[model samples]
Target: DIQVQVNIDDNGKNFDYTYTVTTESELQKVLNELMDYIKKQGAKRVRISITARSSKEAYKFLAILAKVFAELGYNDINRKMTVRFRGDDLEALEKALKEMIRQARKFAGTVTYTLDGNDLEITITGVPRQVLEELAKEAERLAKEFNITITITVTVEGQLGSLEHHH
Candidate 1:
């Protein structure tokens, strides 16, 4: 009773797949369809989610999905991924996050952050796809250098209300 459908529409060509992730066998159907779209149609954008009963279980599902994208050559998979981050040094983490936001503002609409417990959650909107890829790279570097857990979730779209920067 948990069947789900993923719809992909490219220009007017519609492709859809359905599956229920109650087991790995069902999950395989998702990968197969995604791979098909990527190769057969050269899909550029996709949206995915899990309907697990619990938030913790949903993360497990999402992480597995993230790994699939990562292995499929989408190294910046987490750039558009929105999640929380925790670290030993909150000040240092916030400082680094501000710096990242500063650079992202050049090509994004509004970048905002808020504190939840000791976790930092950042949300970015109206950034072009190429710029999001670059921001993703910066996040990975920051995580390694600062020894912090940081994940980025950005809204990818045409630049709106962004600064005019020659780059």
Candidate 2:
């Protein structure tokens, strides 16, 4: 089996951490390890990077990552979540966005979007974590038709106030 690779390290000159996940399962593994590290280290923030072989893979994995982060109480949209696609054609991206919005709404979430020509920014809240992976797989198939390299990043702010009690 070709293993997914992840690189984890401290942020240069800062108290934050940097993580890059090459594959899906490894993404979960790294995030879990991150959760543990945050507990013991009193971490302040995390910057996560994911580069996938295909657009669909990126979208699918991001689904899990975002939902998991939300579960960990990092649901603030101001923290910055970014996804970059290879081409300027927004057709597939639009298609996936619409589908994800529909799915999110159907599953009891609020969806908000701000569009800037080639870039589309969206935030979803109140969505059940269970559905993100399913939606991601659907987005995966949607992007399979287009097949592009995709990269995503999410910066999360760890809950420092509560962590202070641990020490």
Candidate 3:
């Protein structure tokens, strides 16, 4: 399957990874490799670069990747969302936790509600970016007015994810 080629190249300065996908399953294979690499890598960061047949083609892989790495730390550098791994073995845990906190900060002040069986479920996710302490106070107040009950759920999907909540 040369049409669905994935390669990791090292040119002394840096190790560059690339992929070619002709279908969703091929993309999944690439992502599965990525998910594994992130788990065991000792690097401070992981950078992925893709060159497809066209820009439209590039977006296809990007769309899937957006969901695949929904939680990892990413910063748009040079129009690229760089996926950063945590620190060395000793400091990795704390850095990773801090990274999660950092990502959560992006959704600060975000308010979303869902209707579940006539019950209004309001999720208060992350810390509010608003300087005014009244923001959350007001949110709680409004949710109360709607007869909505608010609660939070934390999922421990994997070993690292579970440890984050366990501690």
What TM-score, computed on C-alpha atoms, does each candidate reach?
Answer: 0.48, 0.47, 0.33
Q: Rank the candidates by TM-score, best first.
A: 1, 2, 3
In model 2, the Cα lDDT at residue 110 comes to: 74
Q: For each candidate, what is the lDDT?
A: 0.53, 0.50, 0.37
**Candidate 1 lDDT (Cα, 0 to 1):** 0.53
lDDT of 2 by residue, 97-123 (tens): 677578757867676776566665555
Candidate 3 residue 12 C-alpha distance from true site, Å:
11
Model 3 misplaced stretches (Cα beyond 4 Å): 1-14, 54-56, 71-167
For candidate 2, the TM-score is 0.47
Which model is ahead, 1 or 3, in terms of TM-score? Answer: 1
RMSD of candidate 1 to the truth, in angstroms, is: 11.0
Task: Give the per-residue Cα lDDT of candidate 3 at 83.
Answer: 19
Q: Report the Cα RMSD per candidate.
A: 11.0, 7.1, 18.6
Using TM-score as the measure, the top candidate is 1
